[PDB]
Design an enzyme around this catalytic site. Structure first.
Site, short mmCIF file in Angstrom:
data_model
loop_
_atom_site.label_atom_id
_atom_site.label_comp_id
_atom_site.label_asym_id
_atom_site.label_seq_id
_atom_site.Cartn_x
_atom_site.Cartn_y
_atom_site.Cartn_z
CD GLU A 1 -66.00 -40.37 -16.54
OE1 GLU A 1 -65.60 -41.42 -17.12
OE2 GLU A 1 -66.47 -39.38 -17.15
CG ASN B 1 -65.59 -34.06 -12.63
OD1 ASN B 1 -66.43 -33.19 -12.32
ND2 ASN B 1 -65.34 -34.42 -13.89
CG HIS C 1 -71.68 -34.88 -19.83
ND1 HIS C 1 -71.30 -33.88 -20.70
CD2 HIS C 1 -70.55 -35.23 -19.20
CE1 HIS C 1 -70.05 -33.57 -20.53
NE2 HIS C 1 -69.56 -34.39 -19.61
CD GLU D 1 -66.70 -33.29 -17.48
OE1 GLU D 1 -67.14 -34.09 -18.34
OE2 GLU D 1 -65.66 -33.61 -16.73
CG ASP E 1 -72.70 -31.66 -22.72
OD1 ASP E 1 -73.25 -32.54 -22.01
OD2 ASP E 1 -71.60 -31.88 -23.29
#
Ligand SMILES: O[C@@H]1[C@@H](O)[C@H](O[C@@H]2CO[C@H](O)[C@H](O)[C@H]2O)OC[C@H]1O
Ligand SMILES: *[C@@H]1O[C@H](CO)[C@@H](O)[C@H](O)[C@H]1NC(C)=O
Length: 319
Positions: free
Chosen positions: A131, A172, A208, A238, A240
């Site tokens: 990030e 990432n 996400h 990750e 979702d």
């Protein structure tokens, strides 16, 4: 037979899931996490972060990270290791420090070397920097950027590579999965690391997403190929797909198609090595506590029963 067998039939290295140490006491949960038909790979959600592994300077703590590795080892599952340098979940000593570039750099490098050496041989990949971007593609003004400047990124990669030359080193981030300034900036991070002379092997795309507002398969694929063109691999790290509650049949069906496109985009891009979902059951999703009014983000519900999104993943994997 499941997500991981399907993924590997298509040439992915794995389908996997994150987890966290409190969940490992839940036997029914552990049984399904340990099902290698579905999961060939595990990521620790929290126990390899800086606060967990170096709670005081030069005082490392690996029990909780090691417990997740030991469960993956028991199961024959790969590990992704997450994350070495990140502005969140820092211990107080980092965030409150009066630093110079020299003293923060020494602490950062020492963090990296110790954690990567500890896990040498045990990780498929590291998320070395997490990030580092704002949404407009500028650098996030973390402590590391404020004190060290942009060089912190390649320095972090080079330090990890010295400690473990075999593990795949990833950058990432979120919101780098669709076309735009942030994804362009993530390509530029890859370029910058290599211009320094440092090693980067992969781009990690957090994924996400939001039900009914997920990037399309076409844009996902264009973005994946925009990273593989650079000579790196890619993975969804990750995944979702959070829904605006309440849950309904129609939302669950949309969620299925939204997940389907993610899997299919990865299959369609040579160099996409895998998908990891951010846990696998709605019971344990991080989503409700962060995104108020959203939830039900995963392919199993809160009672460990498959949702339509399981089938959408299988269909996107061509199974
Ligand atoms: O702390 C960060 C969250 O801010 C990040 O939230 C993003 C916000 O933009 C979109 O909404 C994206 O879907 C969400 O995930 O998620 C990763 C987390 O570490
Ligand atoms: C910190 O030091 C490294 C040399 O170790 C350098 O690459 C970088 O420009 C420095 N940053 C700042 C803000 O002084």
């Amino acid at each position: 037979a499941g997500l991981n067998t399907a993924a590997k039939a298509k040439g992915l290295k794995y389908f996997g899931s994150a987890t966290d140490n409190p969940e490992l006491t839940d036997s029914a949960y552990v049984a399904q996490l340990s099902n290698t038909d579905d999961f060939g790979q595990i990521t620790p959600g929290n126990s390899m972060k800086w606060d967990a592994t170096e709670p005081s300077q030069n005082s490392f703590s690996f029990a909780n990270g090691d417990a997740v590795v030991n469960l993956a080892n028991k199961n024959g599952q790969l590990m992704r290791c997450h994350t070495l340098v990140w502005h969140s979940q820092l211990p107080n000593w980092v965030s409150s420090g009066s630093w110079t570039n020299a003293t923060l750099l020494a602490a950062m490098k020492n963090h990296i070397t110790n954690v990567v050496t500890h896990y040498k041989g045990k990780c498929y990949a590291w998320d070395v920097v997490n990030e580092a971007l704002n949404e407009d593609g500028t650098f996030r003004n973390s402590v590391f950027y404020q004190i060290i400047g942009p060089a912190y990124i390649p320095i972090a990669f080079a330090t990890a590579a010295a400690a473990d030359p075999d593990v795949k080193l990833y950058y990432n981030d979120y919101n780098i999965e669709y076309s735009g300034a942030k994804a362009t900036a993530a390509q530029n991070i890859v370029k910058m690391i290599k211009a320094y002379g440092a090693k980067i092997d992969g781009v990690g795309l957090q994924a996400h997403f939001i039900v009914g507002s997920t990037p399309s398969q076409s844009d996902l694929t264009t973005v994946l190929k925009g990273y593989t063109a650079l000579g790196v691999e890619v993975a969804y790290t990750e995944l979702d797909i959070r829904m605006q509650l309440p849950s309904t049949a129609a939302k669950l069906a949309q969620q299925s198609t939204d997940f389907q496109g993610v899997a299919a985009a990865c299959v369609s891009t040579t160099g996409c090595v895998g998908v990891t979902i951010w846990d696998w059951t709605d019971k344990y999703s991080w989503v409700p506590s962060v995104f108020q009014g959203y939830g039900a983000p995963l392919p199993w519900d809160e009672n460990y029963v498959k949702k339509p999104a399981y089938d959408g993943l299988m269909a996107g994997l061509g199974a």
